[PDB]
Design a protein around this ligand. Structure first.
Ligand SMILES: Cc1cccc(C)c1OCC(=O)N[C@@H](Cc1ccccc1)[C@@H](O)C[C@H](Cc1ccccc1)NC(=O)[C@H](C(C)C)N1CCCNC1=O
Lengths: 99, 99
């Protein structure tokens, strides 16, 4: 679908048998989600945003269902203020910026 | 122009008689540019990010020619790693998220 930006591009995703709301972020290289229970092994990692860095856990091969569309990629779990759909996932669902 | 997301969507902007490159961030309510000099006056303001809060100077009525498109709005300047064109401006140039 088409999304104007007069409001935050929030959409509903399905992950780990759970439902959430993630922001479609072209400004994000990766995908980071609020602390949640996820099965499988992970790997420590650090990402640097505007306010600084945060200690997140790196999950590979995690299936996410963005607004219906199913995709699988690397999901980061940490102390983020909002759920973020980064370009690693956005390019799988074919999201494009236009104007 | 249609922009895919395989790489960070960098756009060439022109502000204060200066040329720069800014990221089209759909996950940014406002626009924050790196440290630079500007004519108008400002007002201390802080914004929440991923790793914490930074203090920026606010400016209203700032002309910005985003990739051949002239728009005007509130710009913020501070300790931001990259230049960011948020939604307060993206809408002015009819930028749409699509998939
Ligand atoms: C939310 C907001 C309100 C008012 C004004 C502004 C500028 C606002 O946005 C601030 C902000 O942190 N926005 C983020 C999403 C956001 C909204 C609300 C709360 C917290 C975050 C996101 O869009 C952009 C920001 C840009 C960036 C900054 C420094 C270095 C590199 C990239 N991107 C990142 O942090 C990403 C993360 C998410 C994987 N990131 C970090 C590792 C390297 N690459 C990368 O892409």
């Amino acid at each position: 679908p088409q999304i104007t930006l007069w409001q935050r591009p929030l959409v509903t995703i399905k992950i780990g048998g759970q439902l959430k709301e993630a922001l479609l972020d072209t400004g994000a290289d990766d995908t980071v989600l609020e602390e949640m229970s996820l099965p499988g092994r992970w790997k420590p990692k650090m990402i640097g945003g505007i306010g600084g860095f945060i200690k997140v856990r790196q999950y590979d091969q995690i299936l996410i269902e963005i607004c219906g569309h199913k995709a699988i990629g690397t999901v980061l779990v940490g102390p983020t203020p909002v759920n973020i759909i980064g370009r690693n996932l956005l390019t799988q669902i074919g999201c494009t910026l236009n104007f």
